[PDB]
Design brief:
Assembly: monomeric
Keywords: cbass, CD-NTase, c-di-GMP, transferase
Helix content: 40-55%
PDB class: transferase
Largest sheet: 7 strands, mixed
Number of domains: 2
Entry title: Structure of a STING-associated CdnE c-di-GMP synthase from Flavobacteriaceae sp.
Name: STING-associated CdnE c-di-GMP synthase
Order of helices and strands: HHHHEEHHHEEEHEEHHHHHH
Radius of gyration: 22 Å
Length: 356
Amino acid sequence: SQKNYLELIKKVRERSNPDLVQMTKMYSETLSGSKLFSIEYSDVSIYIKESMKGVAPSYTMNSKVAANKVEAHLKKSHGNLVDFERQGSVMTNTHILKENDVDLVQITNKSSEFDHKGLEKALNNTSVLKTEEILNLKKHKENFYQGNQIDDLKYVRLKSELVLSSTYKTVDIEKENSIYVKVTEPERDIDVVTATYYKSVDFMKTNDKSRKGIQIYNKKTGKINDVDYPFLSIERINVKDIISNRRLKNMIRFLKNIKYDCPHIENKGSIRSFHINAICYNIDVKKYEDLHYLDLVSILYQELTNIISNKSYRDNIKSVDGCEYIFEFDCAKKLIEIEFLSQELDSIIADLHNQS
């Protein structure tokens, strides 16, 4: 191919590790070897490695420390009304830009939204339920607001604007769905999201904390957004990375880097981080958990090729949180981006073959 891997390495470095701090080597680097291909310090291999390893740890740590400092102020102000959590790709370390940050989420915890009809339906259909699920559902029904949910969200949003503006020099309070805080030690910009919980039937069956949803408050409309399950994506990616022998996240970061550097794909196009996560998460771990990192490029190429060629297969791939089919809408536009990504992987594989 005509790819310039020296230029690509410089680009990944500027985004990920400009000071060239020591990064932990992937274990297959020192313990394994490629079945398909000195190749490991070829330029193409170095590009693959640095694209897989992601952002230097100080940036990620600084983001989380900055968000912890913000949390302490909001908790002193009105911690009695909210729980604090985090969301974003930084929470799975699958971001690829050193400037990406965790978001801080504050969730009103006095009242919750929930699936009323679904709870009733589930409790009235006990023949399919495990006994522990019946008991969990029954307790949610038995324990089921004196105040005003929306008024509490508006209150927490405005109270947070006041506390943060009195604490930090630079705070953007004009965005609909978050407050943007410039923390100065460490110097990071943190978005503060205000939400309430949403309890799905699957949450109420299990009490798995990661299955709890949020509905984010929009300050401009005065309404709550549709439910999101950020903690479920985080938990499932982190768990499957462990099951995959610590390879899944390397595949996610690699594909995100390839997309970012591909001139044929818009940065904010039809395939986003959510879709890359879902495509990688859907790969059967047995196909790749023992492969050397270079052989993962071929696994990814095969998966994208199968998505392009096999309609029933692509039509049944779900998001990590299980709530959407990722090719149900805008399928043909998404496939253009998948096709350009597969062409980049084909070139990379060809260039590895030529180095060997």
